[PDB]
Amino acid sequence: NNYDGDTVTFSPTGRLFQVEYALEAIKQGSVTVGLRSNTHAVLVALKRNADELSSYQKKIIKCDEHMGLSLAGLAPDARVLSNYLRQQCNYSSLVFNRKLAVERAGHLLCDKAQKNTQSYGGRPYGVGLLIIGYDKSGAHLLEFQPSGNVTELYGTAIGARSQGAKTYLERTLDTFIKIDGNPDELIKAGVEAISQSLRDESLTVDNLSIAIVGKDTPFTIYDGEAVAKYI
Amino acid sequence: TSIMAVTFKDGVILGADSRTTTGAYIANRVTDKLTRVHDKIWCCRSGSAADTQAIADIVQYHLELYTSQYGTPSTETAASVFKELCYENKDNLTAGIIVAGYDDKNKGEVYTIPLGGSVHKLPYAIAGSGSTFIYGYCDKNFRENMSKEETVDFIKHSLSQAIKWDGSSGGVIRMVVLTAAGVERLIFYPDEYEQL
């Protein structure tokens, strides 16, 4: 009200409204799902078009051979944060000959977002991210909020109507965690999860976007006729 | 210069000659090379007189500010502050410093910091141009846990020989005793130590 003009102002109840408004941009964004087993980790993302002449906005970005994310909200902010992750993954490899841990990648994203919530002049990031990866401690899935809060999960979903997919994963928890050594079945579960968030529209060949990383599987993105198999 | 510091049962004693030279001219025959950076943390200076005075003054400032915030510093801490200055400015400095101090927990300690800026904790240390001539004597005659009187004699005899052979060393032998009892200054004149 009187306390939402900038990010440097707490409200009388201790809230940061500019950060909450940045969180609101994520809820307007298109749905994206993340889930993992012990061998693989999967991202599924519903891409959004402007109209029938337009292309479908890309949702998944590769950060390294063993790591990548999906976005929901302001796409340019995801480009800035993913570029930062690419650099940090790269610094780790060049200097220490070491693949960057997924947990440590989450810590770096948290700290970068935090600086934009405590200083005058700047603004919070207006995007949410789902980071998947496979490192020395197996498969990982992270959820990033632009408040700075990063959380490690078995599965999750962000964007509009994400609550349906999140409930489905909460039921299926015991089943999909056990899908080891079978990439196709893990993606099937992810496609079935994101389907619980659809209304009026369905999953078409240029609508669906899938990514996977695992034990002997580099981070690869599937689009176009490559995902017709899963429709 | 001829300087040395020796730990003993009750603490530590620092020793030094008093000669400062510009070439063959003795610019000061009554110099005080034993310098106070804290109540019971002193140092011995060798090398450039400008450099070692500048360093000691900065260390004294650092330890005074340390004391106001965190209480009495350790001898190890004082040696570290000396090292940081000597190492990081090695290209522009010519300083060889021996740091000696007395804690109640750690008792007498000695740290030597040569040209490069390395640190070496030792039971006793010798340095300066005149030290070269007494490596043999000191190694043969040093014992651990000596008494105050024995340590005074060891330093007196050692620096006497260093003075005898090194033209750069001479004058009076100054000493500073660091124990739980406090801080005692000693001085020994040529007529005394030359006849040893």
Binding site: - | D57, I58, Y61, E64, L65, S68, Q69
Partner: protein, 241 residues
């Protein structure tokens, strides 16, 4: 009405942020007192530990700035420690640059100049503290110099700070009106501390245990604080006459 938010003049020629910083000074609800002897300067302050979970040894508003200078603060602890760290840094730098120990009055002036800047520059707020510096100066002898959020400072024969400063001030005024001298005519610092505690008891009308007080003493070449058992010995002597 933004002339009340930053340090600019109001139509009356007043600085409201400075005035409100003076009010923050009494937020701790603690009273302090300082007096001079022949060879010493004594400062006492109330100690209140309201929580049982607190470590009472860490609760203090008296600071050892240098070997010779001590400082008691009236105001919130964050601003107090801010001022303490700065004073310690200034005292150390002074000694390094000018080759002698920073006098009590000179440090007071320096901290007062820093405070003045906060009243003139808009981006910096005033510190909500009153700083009382004490020492036995090698030139001026026993010394009390006090600084406030306005950037004002002055020397004192004796002084008092806190919510009930006026009661303590008048009590001290009346004593010096009798004796007609600028100090406590006493040889030992122990008896000067006893004078300070007695006259605070009289002015406030309250009794003190060993844990209710905090004492600092300045002598030639050192300033130190008394322990709870040192204060107890002081309280026993007061009660026995």
């Amino acid at each position: 009405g933004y002339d009340r938010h930053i340090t600019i003049f109001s139509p009356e020629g007043r600085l409201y942020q400075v005035e409100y910083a003076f009010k923050a000074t009494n937020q701790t609800n603690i009273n302090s007192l300082a007096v001079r002897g022949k060879d010493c300067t004594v400062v006492i302050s109330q100690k209140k530990v309201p929580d049982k979970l607190l470590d009472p040894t860490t609760v203090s508003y008296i600071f050892c700035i240098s070997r010779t200078i001590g400082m008691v603060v009236n105001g919130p602890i964050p601003d107090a420690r801010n001022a303490a760290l700065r004073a310690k840094a200034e005292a150390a730098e002074f000694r390094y640059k000018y080759g002698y120990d920073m006098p009590c009055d000179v440090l007071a002036k320096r901290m007062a100049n820093l405070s003045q800047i906060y009243t003139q520059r808009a981006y910096m707020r005033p510190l909500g503290v009153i700083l009382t510096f004490v020492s036995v100066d090698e030139e001026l002898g026993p010394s009390i110099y006090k600084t406030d959020p306005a950037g004002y400072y002055v020397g004192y024969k004796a002084t008092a700070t806190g919510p009930k400063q006026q009661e303590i001030t008048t009590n001290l005024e009346n004593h010096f009106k009798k004796s007609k001298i600028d100090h406590i005519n006493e040889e030992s610092w122990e008896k000067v501390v006893e004078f300070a505690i007695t006259h605070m008891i009289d002015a406030l009308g309250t009794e003190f245990s060993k844990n209710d007080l905090e004492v600092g003493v300045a002598t030639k070449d050192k300033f130190f604080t008394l322990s709870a058992e040192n204060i107890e010995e002081r309280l026993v002597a007061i009660a026995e006459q």
